Amino acid sequence: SRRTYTLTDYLKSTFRVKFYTLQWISDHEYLYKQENNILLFNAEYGNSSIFLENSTFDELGYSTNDYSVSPDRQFILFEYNYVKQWRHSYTASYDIYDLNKRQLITEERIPNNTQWITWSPVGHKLAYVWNNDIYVKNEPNLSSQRITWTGKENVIYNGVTDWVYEEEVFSAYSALWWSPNGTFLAYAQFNDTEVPLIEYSFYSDESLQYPKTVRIPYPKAGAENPTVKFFVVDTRTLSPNASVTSYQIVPPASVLIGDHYLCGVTWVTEERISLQWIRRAQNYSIIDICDYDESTGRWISSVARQHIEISTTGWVGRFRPAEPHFTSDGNSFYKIISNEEGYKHICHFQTDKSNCTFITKGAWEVIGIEALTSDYLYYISNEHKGMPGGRNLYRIQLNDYTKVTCLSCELNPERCQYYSASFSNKAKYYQLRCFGPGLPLYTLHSSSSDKELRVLEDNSALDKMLQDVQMPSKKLDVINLHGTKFWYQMILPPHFDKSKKYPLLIEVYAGPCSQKVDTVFRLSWATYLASTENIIVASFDGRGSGYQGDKIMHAINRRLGTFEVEDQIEATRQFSKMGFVDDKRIAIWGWSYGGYVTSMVLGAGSGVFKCGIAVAPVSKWEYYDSVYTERYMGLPTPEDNLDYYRNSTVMSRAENFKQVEYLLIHGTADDNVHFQQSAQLSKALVDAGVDFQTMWYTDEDHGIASNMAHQHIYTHMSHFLKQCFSLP
Amino acid sequence: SRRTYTLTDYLKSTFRVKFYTLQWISDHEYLYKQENNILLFNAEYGNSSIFLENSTFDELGYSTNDYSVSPDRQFILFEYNYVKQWRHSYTASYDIYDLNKRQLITEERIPNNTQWITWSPVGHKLAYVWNNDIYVKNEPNLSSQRITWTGKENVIYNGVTDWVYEEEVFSAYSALWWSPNGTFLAYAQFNDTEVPLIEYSFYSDESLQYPKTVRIPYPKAGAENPTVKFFVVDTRTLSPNASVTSYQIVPPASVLIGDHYLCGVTWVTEERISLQWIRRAQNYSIIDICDYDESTGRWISSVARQHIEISTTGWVGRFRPAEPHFTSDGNSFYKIISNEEGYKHICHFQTDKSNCTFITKGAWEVIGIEALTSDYLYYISNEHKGMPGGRNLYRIQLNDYTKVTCLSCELNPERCQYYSASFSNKAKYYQLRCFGPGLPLYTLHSSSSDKELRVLEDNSALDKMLQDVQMPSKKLDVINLHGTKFWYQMILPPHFDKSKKYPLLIEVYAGPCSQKVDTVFRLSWATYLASTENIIVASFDGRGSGYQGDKIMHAINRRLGTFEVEDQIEATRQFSKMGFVDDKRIAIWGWSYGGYVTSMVLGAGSGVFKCGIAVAPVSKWEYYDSVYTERYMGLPTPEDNLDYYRNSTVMSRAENFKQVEYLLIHGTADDNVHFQQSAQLSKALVDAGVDFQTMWYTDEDHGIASNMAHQHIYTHMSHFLKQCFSLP
Numbered sequence A, B: 001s002r003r004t005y006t007l008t009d010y011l012k013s014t015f016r017v018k019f020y021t022l023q024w025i026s027d028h029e030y031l032y033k034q035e036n037n038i039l040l041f042n043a044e045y046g047n048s049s050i051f052l053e054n055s056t057f058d059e060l061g062y063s064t065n066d067y068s069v070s071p072d073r074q075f076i077l078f079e080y081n082y083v084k085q086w087r088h089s090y091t092a093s094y095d096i097y098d099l100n101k102r103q104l105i106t107e108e109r110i111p112n113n114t115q116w117i118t119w120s121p122v123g124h125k126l127a128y129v130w131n132n133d134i135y136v137k138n139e140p141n142l143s144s145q146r147i148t149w150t151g152k153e154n155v156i157y158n159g160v161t162d163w164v165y166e167e168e169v170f171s172a173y174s175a176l177w178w179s180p181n182g183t184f185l186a187y188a189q190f191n192d193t194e195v196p197l198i199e200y201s202f203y204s205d206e207s208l209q210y211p212k213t214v215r216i217p218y219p220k221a222g223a224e225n226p227t228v229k230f231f232v233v234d235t236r237t238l239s240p241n242a243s244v245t246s247y248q249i250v251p252p253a254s255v256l257i258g259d260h261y262l263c264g265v266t267w268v269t270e271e272r273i274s275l276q277w278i279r280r281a282q283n284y285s286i287i288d289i290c291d292y293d294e295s296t297g298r299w300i301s302s303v304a305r306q307h308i309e310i311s312t313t314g315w316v317g318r319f320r321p322a323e324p325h326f327t328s329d330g331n332s333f334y335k336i337i338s339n340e341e342g343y344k345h346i347c348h349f350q351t352d353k354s355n356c357t358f359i360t361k362g363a364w365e366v367i368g369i370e371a372l373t374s375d376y377l378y379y380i381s382n383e384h385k386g387m388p389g390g391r392n393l394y395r396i397q398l399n400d401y402t403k404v405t406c407l408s409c410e411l412n413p414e415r416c417q418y419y420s421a422s423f424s425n426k427a428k429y430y431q432l433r434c435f436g437p438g439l440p441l442y443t444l445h446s447s448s449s450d451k452e453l454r455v456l457e458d459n460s461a462l463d464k465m466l467q468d469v470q471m472p473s474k475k476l477d478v479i480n481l482h483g484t485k486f487w488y489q490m491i492l493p494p495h496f497d498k499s500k501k502y503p504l505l506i507e508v509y510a511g512p513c514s515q516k517v518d519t520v521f522r523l524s525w526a527t528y529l530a531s532t533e534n535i536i537v538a539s540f541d542g543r544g545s546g547y548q549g550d551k552i553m554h555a556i557n558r559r560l561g562t563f564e565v566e567d568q569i570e571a572t573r574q575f576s577k578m579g580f581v582d583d584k585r586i587a588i589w590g591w592s593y594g595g596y597v598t599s600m601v602l603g604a605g606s607g608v609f610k611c612g613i614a615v616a617p618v619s620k621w622e623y624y625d626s627v628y629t630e631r632y633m634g635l636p637t638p639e640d641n642l643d644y645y646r647n648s649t650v651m652s653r654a655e656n657f658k659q660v661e662y663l664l665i666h667g668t669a670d671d672n673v674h675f676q677q678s679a680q681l682s683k684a685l686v687d688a689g690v691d692f693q694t695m696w697y698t699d700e701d702h703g704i705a706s707n708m709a710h711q712h713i714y715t716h717m718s719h720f721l722k723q724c725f726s727l728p
């Protein structure tokens, strides 16, 4: 009799899922923004005090989207006037507020359009990037000092990444790294002089008479890449009438051979920095640990402190090589790498020795190292119940790898199987974050007694609202393909009657090291399709997917568009044989890589799918960026992998689309998967005489995330889907 | 029992409509390309001879799309390697073939990428434009002489028009004019230095890794326009070691005041040239007749030889002021202008007097003056039967305006009501071209006996094919609106049963001075919709339409988007009341201006239309070019017509689209109605929460005319239409 989860409920977020975001500022204290008030909580006693009243934000231009308190707690930074750029980058305005004299620094302010800013790890120094140059302010009220002079739009980047490093290498816009005690400021410089430009029209507000052309240095497969340099600036000598004292650290010879990338920076101590470089091929990476020479100011490296990591069956790491986690002394480190069996586990390395020792093993994988003390190492893995789509926090004794405890496994076995964690300094306390399968749950714990100090947020409000509505259920299970067991999930309609025949909707991603099958709780479009439209929405992780060993992940090496596409078809074929699926009404959709896979499926002529929707899909790999594409496909030259580049385009399967109903969608301002991709795909379908539907979204980028576009696209795909399934 | 005219029949042109293209080369001879053979016909005796065997084209690179024989018949020009640009412009390669020594000129050839080329009116001189500069060749085998040095891509144009002059002023790419006896070569120079650039992406062949950006100097409403200069070059002194002798003719002071355009050039005699200029406003034009001064080389003008033409209720002429037609002596001319009642008729002017005398009158209009001898004047009008959508050839005695004969009216009253004509030199013979309502019919006639020498093409083959198929019928009639009678047409399905109720498709254009209702025979998409899908396709010419007097045409002056849109709604409303139309299923579609109107109707909230399709529509007048837009709307400034510019956008009616099914289509490479227009329109619909369909066509220009795109768009609109009409 109750209501169903509606499209409007989804599009409007009428069912709010709460969370708990905190920032640790010591080994037992943390800040929390509550009702626009910044409160200081003491993990020990649970008591809190007001750190900054809600009545201070009231007048800072307008909305204050973010804050950052200096480590010495003397100042606070206010971020506002946010202007988004790519996936991670953006520019903003900042105000510095003196917490002592409780005033607002007015002289020597931070520039407008600041690209990045950060306090030093200690004290209250500031470093920021503006107009592609780096500046340092020793005091909030004193004049900043310019560190670089080469900054230049679309050419030289100091302190921040260019387009490709942001998206594929750093997964961040930032390229600045203060040393632990603020002595040194390390940064990377990117040169895009020889990178070709992708250009597209941005129409802007209706009042703009002429469209403007956006230009981005974007390297497509096999094109010229940006070069990079790494510098360590000694901030001690920074003065208005002094030059900048900096040293340039170059990569090891084994990398200087040809094109390469800087993929990681980690400070070990005030005089020891760790750099991780990888060759353009991405099957050879190396860690170079450089020591500061106090009598020359040089950062020296030695072959003894270099650690090589290669891959013979594919690429190194998941999306990039894993980061090293050093001990306080810096004489050793722990890092995730592939073991003998192809599973990723933690290996213990000695800084000046090449041999490492695995401290974990099994047919499961370590997702990442979370914290490290002199006695324990905390990490996250999907070992529990052997569920690759589950996550838990584990702790292992460093003096006896035999003693490993699961800190999250049994807290709420039914409600919580997917966690992430955030540790305080020195790992004395930690917040545990549960994302499903039940309602998210945030908790605070002590590392000494493993006791649960308290419940930070349990979403009891959401629970209330949902018991009044007919929610669908999510079931996870397994099936066999090629003698290998793979996972899949199904969002089943309320009051699921294994008798009736329901229409199926396959939602796919399926890109290298992907995971669409997990135990995370999500109020999604699928929630609505199952709840209101009685459609079954399933997902499957086959060959190429991650967190199940290099064996399954590297299956699609140098051959994207083959096995992962084929496995979606065979898995759907097995789903359609289970009596509760109307094989006459099967569809599939995806975004990005899921859009590519969706298209490849539809064009396979399997006769299995009736219709499909592709949103901002890749259509030809030579159109995508160099870092991501080459990592799996090599170079598109007749000497390397051109043949597999050519027969993996969606265009080459155009004729087969005559057998299905296809919906192609794309944002005209997509800086990531260029509109070109869909423009070229549609032209191939037109030339083949194939009828299909289209939908462009003016000025929307890769996310197609503006409030109105977001609502419009899901509304549109719903009509298309219901038309195809003959649903009223 | 027979077949119906199918979509495939239309898309593939299975039913060929033949024509007869000839080129007059004297007062009694003409050339005709037959089976790749150039034959020379003698109108007098009807006998023909081979002028150039089909066996000469065989090897000229490849296909020879066109030929041009010099007037002295000594040479012939072969055009090939055609590369289209805008609506009229294109570049090509040319070979000169010596008809005497029957050889092929090999030395001093014509450049590749030639923009325009033409023989002189006599002899065998040649003038051509290459890289925006003019060149003259006195002999096919001799070196050409460069005439201009200012040529520059997207900036200076010598001898050819820029984008806006090509599309809106000259309706041609050409800007060169030889004098009657080849002495002088006149040309216009266009400067686009200050014209803003419209830019858009061209994706090209799938193999192009990066899309290229096309840039065109295009002036939008109120923007900076291109300036122009007119020169008369004396070719007699052209020599390799001599400078160029030329004179610059400037416009009359009444035009130099502000911005203006050169809209017409006409040579009167070897020493008298006629220039027609118009102000940017386009409600004031003037004809300046300049005489050559043999002792100074100057081209002099006098106030006595100037003729002003203004409009107080709108703009001058139809799309541009009509051209003057001078007598051999050049002492007088005949030109179409609006009379006292607002109807366009022929006025007789004296070159040095300001008063003219109308030689025709009535509630009908003269379409154009076709030929002029010392005894008669031939013209075309829609006077017959008072049908504004009919055309006929008339002849009027110059010494007695009372004697006027209709030469085409009664030849085939049932089969032919729409003619055009082509006269030989001195008007001794003429070809008559009938375009409907029956099958096209070409005939050759003598001016002396008005006798029909012979039938050039009667399409008897097409007649044969069509009697085997169920063709629809076209009926023309009238209806009253605001006390004024307007015309409309309906393509009725075969075996039309005035009983049953059929869905109605309204095909609209309705732009200023347009005519959708005529008696021309057309194998169109509508032919298929009526014949096979049993849909009625109607068209209506209301306020704003042409050929019915300035009264009706100037109705929409300074207010586009109002009356012509409203009249389509009221006329459809009256059509729906006629018992044979299903009021529940009515649609409307259009192209360009028809797309605008179509969209303005769908957004009127009249409740009359269920669905509609708009192809490459204008959505906001400030986005269209200056010449066309300003002609009807004035300037978009608060001092002029900004208010009507703002409330006539399609966007302002977005909310109303929630009541209809809308299909928006646009070529991404449209240089005319920029993709911007539809991009901005769709964004307004998305912001309003309106659901609608879309369809972009990669790299297609304004015509969307590539073979595959052509077939695809009509196939797509047919599915949309049938979905909306619930037709299987």
Ligand SMILES: *[C@@H]1O[C@H](CO)[C@@H](O[C@@H]2O[C@H](CO)[C@@H](O)[C@H](O)[C@H]2NC(C)=O)[C@H](O)[C@H]1NC(C)=O
Pocket (backbone or CB within 6 Å): A560, A561, A562, A644, A647, A648, A649
């Ligand atoms: C591209 O072409 C290759 C080579 O023909 C395809 O690889 C074969 O795929 C078939 C599946 O139909 C397998 O039976 C063979 O074992 C494969 N051979 C190799 C060399 O792996 C590949 O599937 C094609 N890729 C795409 C995207 O269609």
Ligand SMILES: *[C@@H]1O[C@H](CO)[C@@H](O[C@@H]2O[C@H](CO)[C@@H](O)[C@H](O)[C@H]2NC(C)=O)[C@H](O)[C@H]1NC(C)=O
Pocket (backbone or CB within 6 Å): B150, B156, B191, B192, B193, B194
């Ligand atoms: C094309 O038109 C532009 C006007 O914009 C001319 O440029 C001006 O030329 C004069 C004289 O040389 C200079 O004093 C101005 O400074 C120029 N202004 C600009 C906008 O550049 C240009 O010379 C013209 N070219 C031709 C071939 O006529």
Ligand SMILES: *[C@H]1O[C@H](CO)[C@@H](O[C@@H]2O[C@H](CO)[C@@H](O)[C@H](O)[C@H]2NC(C)=O)[C@H](O)[C@H]1NC(C)=O
Pocket (backbone or CB within 6 Å): A035, A036, A037, A053, A054, A055
């Ligand atoms: C700043 O802080 C006060 C609390 O100290 C906020 O007041 C609370 O508001 C929530 C709902 O918004 C109530 O449920 C609490 O009970 C309120 N507490 C009090 C003091 O009554 C106040 O809303 C905040 N100011 C702003 C900017 O909204």
Ligand SMILES: *[C@H]1O[C@H](CO)[C@@H](O[C@H]2O[C@H](CO)[C@@H](O)[C@H](O)[C@H]2NC(C)=O)[C@H](O)[C@H]1NC(C)=O
Pocket (backbone or CB within 6 Å): B560, B561, B562, B643, B644, B647, B648, B649
């Ligand atoms: C918007 O501009 C004017 C503003 O009123 C509109 O008004 C005109 O058209 C009406 C038709 O409903 C007439 O009733 C008004 O009298 C007439 N106003 C004037 C001053 O003559 C006009 O129609 C609108 N144009 C568009 C495109 O919507």
Ligand SMILES: *[C@@H]1O[C@H](CO)[C@@H](O)[C@H](O)[C@H]1NC(C)=O
Pocket (backbone or CB within 6 Å): A040, A041, A042, A045, A047, A048, A049
């Ligand atoms: C919490 O209370 C303790 C005493 O039990 C005090 O020492 C501490 O400073 C307080 N922490 C806060 C809320 O800052």
Ligand SMILES: *[C@@H]1O[C@H](CO)[C@@H](O)[C@H](O)[C@H]1NC(C)=O
Pocket (backbone or CB within 6 Å): A150, A156, A191, A192, A193, A194
């Ligand atoms: C950027 O790279 C280009 C191309 O190699 C080079 O010419 C230029 O000097 C470099 N600039 C800097 C600041 O490194």
Ligand SMILES: *[C@@H]1O[C@H](CO)[C@@H](O)[C@H](O)[C@H]1NC(C)=O
Pocket (backbone or CB within 6 Å): A239, A240, A241
């Ligand atoms: C730095 O130099 C400027 C003049 O160039 C001078 O005004 C200022 O006093 C100097 N600062 C220091 C550190 O003395």
Ligand SMILES: *[C@@H]1O[C@H](CO)[C@@H](O)[C@H](O)[C@H]1NC(C)=O
Pocket (backbone or CB within 6 Å): A281, A283, A284, A310, A311, A312, A313, A314, A634
């Ligand atoms: C590393 O990748 C390159 C790129 O093709 C390849 O030639 C080489 O064999 C690879 N090396 C390993 C360790 O597999």
Ligand SMILES: *[C@@H]1O[C@H](CO)[C@@H](O)[C@H](O)[C@H]1NC(C)=O
Pocket (backbone or CB within 6 Å): B040, B041, B042, B045, B047, B048, B049
């Ligand atoms: C037709 O024949 C006549 C002979 O009476 C001749 O004069 C004429 O040139 C011929 N027509 C042509 C040009 O083929």
Ligand SMILES: *[C@@H]1O[C@H](CO)[C@@H](O)[C@H](O)[C@H]1NC(C)=O
Pocket (backbone or CB within 6 Å): B240, B241
């Ligand atoms: C014309 O100029 C050319 C180029 O300098 C020269 O070779 C030629 O002799 C000149 N013609 C004469 C002789 O007048």
Ligand SMILES: *[C@@H]1O[C@H](CO)[C@@H](O)[C@H](O)[C@H]1NC(C)=O
Pocket (backbone or CB within 6 Å): B281, B282, B283, B284, B310, B311, B312, B313, B634, B635, B640
């Ligand atoms: C000519 O047209 C312009 C266009 O705005 C107008 O301002 C001017 O008054 C008009 N004059 C005549 C003769 O109609």
Ligand SMILES: *[C@H]1O[C@H](CO)[C@@H](O)[C@H](O)[C@H]1NC(C)=O
Pocket (backbone or CB within 6 Å): B035, B036, B037, B053, B054, B055
């Ligand atoms: C060219 O014309 C001749 C005329 O005799 C004709 O017979 C021949 O078929 C034609 N050749 C072609 C197809 O070009």
Ligand SMILES: NCC1(c2ccccc2)CCCC1
Pocket (backbone or CB within 6 Å): A167, A168, A511, A592, A593, A618, A628, A672, A673
């Ligand atoms: N850029 C890497 C990703 C991608 C791949 C193909 C297409 C779009 C986006 C894959 C993982 C995050 C985004």
Ligand SMILES: NCC1(c2ccccc2)CCCC1
Pocket (backbone or CB within 6 Å): B167, B168, B511, B592, B593, B618, B628, B672, B673
């Ligand atoms: N520009 C001239 C035309 C037009 C008008 C509006 C929109 C597109 C095209 C009007 C007549 C021919 C084409």
